[PDB]
Design a protein around this ligand. Structure first.
Ligand SMILES: [Ca+2]
Ligand SMILES: [Ca+2]
Ligand SMILES: [Ca+2]
Ligand SMILES: [Ca+2]
Ligand SMILES: [Ca+2]
Ligand SMILES: [Ca+2]
Ligand SMILES: [Ca+2]
Ligand SMILES: [Ca+2]
Ligand SMILES: [Ca+2]
Ligand SMILES: [Ca+2]
Ligand SMILES: [Ca+2]
Ligand SMILES: [Ca+2]
Ligand SMILES: [Ca+2]
Ligand SMILES: [Ca+2]
Ligand SMILES: [Ca+2]
Ligand SMILES: [Ca+2]
Ligand SMILES: [Ca+2]
Ligand SMILES: [Ca+2]
Ligand SMILES: [Ca+2]
Ligand SMILES: [Ca+2]
Ligand SMILES: [Ca+2]
Ligand SMILES: [Ca+2]
Ligand SMILES: [Ca+2]
Lengths: 615, 205
């Protein structure tokens, strides 16, 4: 049903299990049953399972969870023992337990809040260890020790994560002293409120992450596996253990003394600060990667002695100084202001930098400046299965090569990068990992090579240059600007967008024009706008007519008021002409020729607007 | 014993030292400068070299002199084999990365000069009157037993000027006279958490 599951109450028994399910339809919401268990003095264990909560979607069955209330016999007594030792939950709304004999809680699925009270026993309790086994648990809100506030709570909390990731939105334990996170799968505590904590100790294989910034007085010890914390001006010796760990610091220098060692493995140090020099400070050790990310992250950062660099969202413009050779930057989120990299030594002529862009969604990497680097390698990386296009302004005024790899698109702003003679995005991979590039090269008579990838790419050369442009798979747009250009749109419906007139010597050759490819002549319509028909009888001349003769023949008509297209086949190759002139001379200046390698018959092929589609 | 050349070498010009204290001035050098054994001394007029464009101090304790607006020589693999960083010259000034040096020196300067990322047990020797406040900031000042060794070393009376040592608890000053005829050095110390000042030496302060 969509109408909600009515109460469930149990009283008494050696052990109790109430197992709800919800089987409602795919666009409805059923809210589940309120459960109450009240033990008699035989009740050692209680279990209350439900179906996991979800939001009513197009194909998602909606479920809200029922409150659960568990109460032991001796819950209100000042003296009587109490019998409920273990409680197991499998999803829940606003849950309560109240038992002075409680040691273990097993959590699972989707929760709202758990409030743990112990019996109102007046005697001061001696055993005060909450074992809290988690497995696939996610919480809207707080696990609280209700007893700790005004009475005698648990002094030591143990959390054993198991077979699946768990996330506790908030853990509130005001009498807690030790906190040990153990087991088998990640435990994440988004926010703890445990002022009296003297230590935290991860022993867990996958690791533990704590989203709340630790107390400056609070010791933390990691184990194997990716543990992950936030520190301020710490007073204590923080150890991170083995595996790939992550500490975020809110202040650049520590305090008292006041240290943090990353331990074995590749560990990230995150600088949420106005500048850093972590290599210098012996207080920090065992770190390999420096990441600049956070709401206070900004300014000048000493890269020295790190083997890798990362960047996330930032407060303002951030600069990496003293960057050693073979050290690459990975950008993980949109930063604020220009990101400058300045290397240890830029002076050589074979300088290589590895920039990486790595995100699940479209990433606006912003401006990164790489003065004195000759080869710039860009990886554009998508972390999920669904395709996107990243954006970057590169300022690399002495780069000769740009190579793009990866599996996401890159629209690259290239303004002012005038040394670039080789753009190679050929290795790029998705349906639409679309690469956009425009050469900023102005060296007269240069050889420039532009390579597209699997995406629907948009590659523009330079009027200055003899551009070789090659799209990969997909709907590529190759732009002609001037000079002796060689175009190859690979597989797919490519568009050869002709925006310049050229000469009789400096013109575009299109190597592989085939059925489906287009020839956009909008930009050479000097006088008016082209044919518009299916204009398709080849100009024919004699067995030994010259290219010069065929050109003159093709331009014989009057193009003064209205430009006209014609075409011919000379010496084994196919040519297209735009006549924009009076006399029967093809005039180099305003009349235009386009070469197409091979015999391609344009008989049946038709002019769209000023756009010729090969038939 | 060595050779010393007071003129700045041509940027095109190769130099090779032997054993013994050789000593030159370099600009934006284009060539691979070697200094050999013994306690050598190169003064650079520009912070980064050129073309390529390197200078190796070789064996022994060698001084690198920064006649520049800031330095970070540890980072640049173009410079290697140096042990002491001195800030001295008519263009010498600003922020200087002490990292990876085992000693520090100071001479006459263009303006206020700052030593950053200074490792523990690294001392400064002042050799001539500088211009503007000389700030030392250590790698880690946070402890409560921080010791710094300042030395003043001259033949004549030396006006060391202001040196700032934020976060140092014990400041040791040596006042050293290099000749037989007595003098008195002068210093403004700014050491707002120093509990001890110990003065040794054979000249006045
Ligand atoms: Ca109570
Ligand atoms: Ca009580
Ligand atoms: Ca209490
Ligand atoms: Ca660890
Ligand atoms: Ca580690
Ligand atoms: Ca360090
Ligand atoms: Ca490590
Ligand atoms: Ca994606
Ligand atoms: Ca370079
Ligand atoms: Ca560059
Ligand atoms: Ca392509
Ligand atoms: Ca061109
Ligand atoms: Ca293509
Ligand atoms: Ca094609
Ligand atoms: Ca056009
Ligand atoms: Ca004509
Ligand atoms: Ca020598
Ligand atoms: Ca030497
Ligand atoms: Ca040496
Ligand atoms: Ca070096
Ligand atoms: Ca004297
Ligand atoms: Ca101190
Ligand atoms: Ca002090």
């Amino acid at each position: 049903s969509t109408t909600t599951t009515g109460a469930i109450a149990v009283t008494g028994g050696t052990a109790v299990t109430v197992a709800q399910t919800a089987g409602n339809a795919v666009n409805t919401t059923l809210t589940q049953a309120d459960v109450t268990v009240t033990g008699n003095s035989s009740t050692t264990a209680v279990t209350v399972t439900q179906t996991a909560a979800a939001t009513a979607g197009a194909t998602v069955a909606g479920r809200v969870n029922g409150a659960v209330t568990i109460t032991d016999s001796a819950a209100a007594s000042a003296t009587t023992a109490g019998k409920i030792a273990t409680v197991t939950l499998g999803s829940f709304g606003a849950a309560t337990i109240d038992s002075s004999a409680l040691t273990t809680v097993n959590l699972s699925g989707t929760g709202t809040s758990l409030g743990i009270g112990r019996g109102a026993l007046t005697a001061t309790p001696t055993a005060n260890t909450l074992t809290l086994n988690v497995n696939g648990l996610t919480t809207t809100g707080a696990i609280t020790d209700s007893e700790a506030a005004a009475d005698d709570g648990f002094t030591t909390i143990n959390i054993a994560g198991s077979t699946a990731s768990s996330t506790i939105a908030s853990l509130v334990a005001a009498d807690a002293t030790t906190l040990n996170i153990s087991g088998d799968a990640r435990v994440t505590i988004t926010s703890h409120t445990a002022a009296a904590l003297t230590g935290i100790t991860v022993t867990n294989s996958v690791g533990a992450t704590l989203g709340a910034e630790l107390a400056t007085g609070l010791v933390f010890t990691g184990g194997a596996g990716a543990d992950s914390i936030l520190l301020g001006a710490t007073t204590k010796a923080i150890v991170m253990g083995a595996g790939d760990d992550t500490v975020t610091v809110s202040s650049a220098t520590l305090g008292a003394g006041g240290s943090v060692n990353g331990g074995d493995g590749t560990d990230v140090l995150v600088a949420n600060v106005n500048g850093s020099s972590f290599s210098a400070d012996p207080a920090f050790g065992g770190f390999e990667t420096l990441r600049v990310a956070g709401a206070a992250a900004q300014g000048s950062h000493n890269a020295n002695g790190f083997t890798a660099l990362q960047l996330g969202a930032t407060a303002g413009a951030t600069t990496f100084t003293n960057v050693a050779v073979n050290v690459g930057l990975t950008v993980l989120a949109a930063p604020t202001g220009t990101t400058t990299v300045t290397l240890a030594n830029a002076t050589g002529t074979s300088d290589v930098f590895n920039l990486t862009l790595s995100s699940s969604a479209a990433l606006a990497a912003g401006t990164v400046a790489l003065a004195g680097v000759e080869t710039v390698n860009i990886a554009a990386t998508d972390t999920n299965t669904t395709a996107h296009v990243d954006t970057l302004t590169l300022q690399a005024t002495s780069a000769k090569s740009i190579v793009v790899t990866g599996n996401a698109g890159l629209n690259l702003t290239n303004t002012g990068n005038t040394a670039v003679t080789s753009f190679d995005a050929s290795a790029v991979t998705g349906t639409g990992s679309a690469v956009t590039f425009v050469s900023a090269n102005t060296t007269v008579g240069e050889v420039v090579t532009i390579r597209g990838g699997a995406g629907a790419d948009s590659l523009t050369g330079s009027a200055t240059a003899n551009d070789t442009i090659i799209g990969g798979a997909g709907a590529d747009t190759l732009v002609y600007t001037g000079g002796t250009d060689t175009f190859t749109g690979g597989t797919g419906a490519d568009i050869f967008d002709i925006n310049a007139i050229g000469t009789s010597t400096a013109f575009v050759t299109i190597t592989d024009a085939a059925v489906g490819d287009k020839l956009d002549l909008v930009g050479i319509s000097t006088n008016g706008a082209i044919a518009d028909g299916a204009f398709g009888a080849a100009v024919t001349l004699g067995a030994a007519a010259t290219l010069a003769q065929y050109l003159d023949a093709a331009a014989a008509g009057d193009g003064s008021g209205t430009s006209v297209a014609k075409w011919f086949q000379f010496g084994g190759d196919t040519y297209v002409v735009v006549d924009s002139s009076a006399g029967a001379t093809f005039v180099s200046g305003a009349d235009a020729v386009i070469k197409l390698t091979g015999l391609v018959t344009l008989t049946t092929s038709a002019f769209a607007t000023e756009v010729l589609t090969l038939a």
